[PDB]
Amino acid sequence: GTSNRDWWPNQLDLSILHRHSSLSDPMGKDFNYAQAFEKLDLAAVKRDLHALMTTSQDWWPADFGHYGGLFIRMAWHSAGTYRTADGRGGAGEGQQRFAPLNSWPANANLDKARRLLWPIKQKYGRAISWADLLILTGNVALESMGFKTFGFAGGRADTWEPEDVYWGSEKIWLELSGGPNSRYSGDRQLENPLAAVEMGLIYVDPEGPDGNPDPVAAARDIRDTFARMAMNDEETVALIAGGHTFGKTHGAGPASNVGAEPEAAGIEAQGLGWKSAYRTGKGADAITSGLEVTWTTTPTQWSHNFFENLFGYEWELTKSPAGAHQWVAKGADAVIPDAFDPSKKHRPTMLTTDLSLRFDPAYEKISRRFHENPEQFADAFARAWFKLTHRDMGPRARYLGPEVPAEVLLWQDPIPAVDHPLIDAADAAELKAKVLASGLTVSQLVSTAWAAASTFRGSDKRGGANGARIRLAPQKDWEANQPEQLAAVLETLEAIRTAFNGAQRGGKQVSLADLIVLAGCAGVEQAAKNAGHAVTVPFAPGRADASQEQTDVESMAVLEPVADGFRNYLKGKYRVPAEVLLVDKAQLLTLSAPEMTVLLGGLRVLGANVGQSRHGVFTAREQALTNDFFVNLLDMGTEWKPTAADADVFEGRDRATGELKWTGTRVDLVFGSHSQLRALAEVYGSADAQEKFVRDFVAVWNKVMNLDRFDLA
Amino acid sequence: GTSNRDWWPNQLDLSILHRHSSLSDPMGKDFNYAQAFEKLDLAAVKRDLHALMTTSQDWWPADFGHYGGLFIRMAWHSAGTYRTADGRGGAGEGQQRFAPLNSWPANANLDKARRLLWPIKQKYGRAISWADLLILTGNVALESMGFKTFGFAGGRADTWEPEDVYWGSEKIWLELSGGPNSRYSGDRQLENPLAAVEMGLIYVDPEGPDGNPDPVAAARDIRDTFARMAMNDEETVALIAGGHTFGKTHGAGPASNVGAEPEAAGIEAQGLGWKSAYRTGKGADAITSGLEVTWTTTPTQWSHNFFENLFGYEWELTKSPAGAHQWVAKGADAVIPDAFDPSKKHRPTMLTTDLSLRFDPAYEKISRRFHENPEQFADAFARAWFKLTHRDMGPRARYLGPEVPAEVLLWQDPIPAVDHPLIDAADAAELKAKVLASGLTVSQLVSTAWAAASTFRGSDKRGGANGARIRLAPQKDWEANQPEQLAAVLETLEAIRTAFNGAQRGGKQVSLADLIVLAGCAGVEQAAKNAGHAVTVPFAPGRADASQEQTDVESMAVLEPVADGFRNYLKGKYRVPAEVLLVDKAQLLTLSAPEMTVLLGGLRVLGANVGQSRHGVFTAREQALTNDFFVNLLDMGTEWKPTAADADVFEGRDRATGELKWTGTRVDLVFGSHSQLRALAEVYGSADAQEKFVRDFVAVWNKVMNLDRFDLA
Ligand code: HEM
Ligand code: HEM
Ligand SMILES: [Cl-]
């Protein structure tokens, strides 16, 4: 059946903005997962999970009689898809249970792991999400095997369809670099936003880069991909060596014995995949990655044996029974237990990427320190495990249940608690009048609030105006934020703030975070008045100001908007067309297509463009809140053509005279070209639509202003 | 970016069930288009459209100084995509303005026609939909040129994204038959549900079948496609000759001059396409189809000159300036006006498909009668034009405005007026108790009501339980409806009805249509009580009973369910797997994926299967409304394998013992296989889900019962 994507494979895709509708959700529209979770008997769930660890099922027998290593890998892979570049992936949506991740080659046999958990899921129902369950199971696996975890938070609501993520452009699973759709160019430079070396891997190839078994070059891939997952060297070594303290890999026979992944399997497979024709196809005969490595002498118990083995032997390159590259300890005795036959022991083995932790010089120093100081290792691994499995959960306000660690961690972008009365409505009116009396213009107030609030992304719930980080490094210096203009607004607002706060009684004070937002609201009000409309814009106080010391400058860098169509900004030339980057930003903002449309057309007329660019400013009454963008964009009296200087800038001329009326970019003109966007623009450009436009603009403006307000959840 | 559809191109696509979300709709959740339309000054809109007909724009100059022919073609094409097989296509959703239909080669230059109407659309805003405006414009065209239309109804609400329609499997526009994705097999048998001879055409190729200019063979393709659009020979001849009374074709130069269709065009083309390098690119130089024919001596005035020319000349095969096959009158004088140069005239010309109306012997008889009696022609054309443009609008209850024709037409599947008091809540309770006391079983009652209500399709708003047509030919004899069992139920209900209605005063009576639905409601309540749960199922009276004489038996044939997964029914073996046909049915029923899931699982345990098949009946308490379908389907204690006799029937055995527990079809087991469906089944299969399951089942049951209830809109 031929589709629109077949005929016009490059047209923009707006269905990414309309996922996750109430239509696909089986829960009623008022269901609140946090409320369900908070009444869960978490202790009961944990007891059942502890029981499960050693309850072997014959359709996928437990190695060593204990599923803990399998479950650790399952939770690690749940979390492991995370990319800092866009915040997409991670554990927080339970996406391992849907395509494509349920069928990635690196997730082979995790279908079995998930299926082992169905009885517990069934028993507790909506009070524990799959998303929470995968991580809690990993925690219980660790605790069961003698490792004390740093804590756990619930609150990951389940989702009900696949998330739209760019995972790469290869058309072949596990394609090595340099193909027609390579993710690598130059000196092994991985394309942003990707954080894995091959399509269908988590981070790196366990055999080495492009299959070449060099530990030193593998380390370079490890460092790069883990950094793209928000992890530094100490965290990386702790996580790899911690995880590989447990369990084993599976490669008992040739890979050609393994059949179709879950999404390809027949209907009778009932959602499982990778059925194997090798011997019994399971247990002792399992094939998952094709590697056959068991790291420690006690694979079901926390130990310090990983680093003892890593440093205590020299290593020889060998092949598994499936033909994959791996390492075996020279001259060792058979000291590692077999998973099924108590009469069999094996020599210590390692992956190429495990050897990276000894042969990369920076990792070697950490590894040695961990070998010499095992308590350091344990604490680092516990902290890293917590970070790995919570890094996409957002502010601490979203963390639920009795095991949330009290310690505030820098990567959580912490926001101080408020410990004073908040401004009320009379105070808000007094502050908005002060702001408008200061001389700050509508363009300045809207631009500033926009810059502050629009760093939010719903993928990992980072960013937003809470914290007033716009005033700190690095946000204060981002080009899109117009650092010189920004500084002047902030000084004026800080003086208003100081004067208001110094006049108060009791402890009442306004934060700068709240004042930035409220000043934006006053801008919008003023713009509506400029257009002859009375409009009140809603404002909710309660934001606090974070410090520079609470603000990791290197972690904040990934929030920098290099493309922000809402301010007609593009920091450089990119291969993806600007209108696709606009839709991508709208998705991170949680906007629908109508919301993106209304928002952009209003911002253009309020003066929110970077540098005061006239591109898309289709009005003769700038700083007035009108639907002029739409009415003028849709006027067939104007003809548009690209400029000779720049094919991405367009000139709009009177059709009859030739006279220049406007200029615009691709992000402006898409609204007149894309047949779905244009249908939305037509609603707002109609004669009956001015009041609708104003009211829909205020609603979407407020939405953006509140995106990070989980304190009001 | 590689997508799930790239990796698994045959997996089932559930996003067809989740279109039209409140996310994508720019109007607020409370917008009601009928309430807007009812206050539109339709007379004023028509005056504006009348003026537009002779107000030429220089970017697309009006042939003859009159846009009427262009607008008639536009309205005809808006309607002309309709297929009776599934009800999909037609003018009722305004889909011409979205992909793919906006860019079909047969719709070339209708982009210009729609753009001409933006000022009016803009002026009247949400009070007239695009969908209604396209049709209205064609009526105003006709009226402006001296033709009396049959009437007009508003009420077609606009849509905001493309509909999911199977238009064929070809990957090339206008592909000739016999390719690797041919839509023809056997002796020129067009595959169902398609109603056009090539991809991107409306009905037929104007040059002849596969480009062969034989009018006799063309006539076969005309008859077949028009019948697949619900039009008979009289109506077909009336429509083709009626439409070709007006305007002209456009083929002034070679087609290689014409550029990209709108969806492929550059951003600067602002939604238009087919830009032409031939001379001025427009007006006297226009190229649309590549044909260059002007049919009558007065292309801007209704006449009977089409038939005067068709029968008063002999015709010679010729070529247009673009090389297309067309016909010219032998020996004729230059009597046809030129569209722009008042000093130039031309000989009469015709398409191959126009000549079909004289050289097909059946058409020739109708065409001669129309030639001799042009008043017969005018009335047939007006009736056909109304039917064409309204055929997908649904029951007459949906028809809005002051020009609705009072004549009731058989093709409307008309429902008599109700002229008596309706039953109240106490009456409904009395009737449900009588029905249950009669001995009719839960399975009988549920199956009967399901059979009656589930003929609805949202594509053209035909079918449903209103009318009690289940008791008439042909519904009473459809295999899926189990004719002998259905007859026994209907006799019992008719006796209850007679007794209740004979006891009343005051003229209160209950229709059989209502009692069929009410009795199904009693069954569902009884099933709930069998499970230990008291629930009330909502019921809304006001359906009426249609007669046999008010029922077109041949038009009702396309509503027969040949595949109904909700009753585990497949009338024969099809190319398309049964789970794909289930999703197709659910889309016609307007169900989401959660709604489809709940409904199916509940119908399985109520005894709704055709023939009392055990397939999918995963319960030991049949006729009790429980979630047993889901709990048993999801039990990993059961292993599934296809049977040797039939690869589409599966046995479920105990994994440990081999003992046979169940049988199922593809439609049952897809809920345990597809990863999104399985996620939904898991919710309803959980230990906390009995209350939810019952509530959600009752709600979707009531939804299905009420699909055709536009009297309650
Ligand atoms: C450079 C990074 C890493 C690579 C290349 C890697 C590679 C793999 C491979 C190839 C397997 C075998 C799959 C199979 O055949 O069953 C595996 C197993 C496993 N990995 Fe990793 N791993 C990495 C990091 C991690 C991390 C960070 C953790 C957790 C903290 C982890 C925990 C596990 C465990 C527990 C197993 C054993 C599974 C079982 O017992 O069934 N690994 N690793
Ligand atoms: C066998 C069925 C039919 C065929 C093959 C056919 C074919 C065409 C073609 C090839 C064009 C020329 C497009 C262009 O070059 O501008 C056209 C024009 C047109 N057709 Fe048809 N047609 C059919 C039925 C109808 C029907 C049912 C009507 C309306 C009742 C209709 C009304 C028109 C009008 C009014 C024009 C002139 C457009 C103008 O003036 O711009 N046609 N036809
Ligand atoms: Cl994601």
Ligand SMILES: [Cl-]
């Ligand atoms: Cl459609």
Ligand code: NA
């Ligand atoms: Na994420």
Ligand code: NA
């Ligand atoms: Na339709």
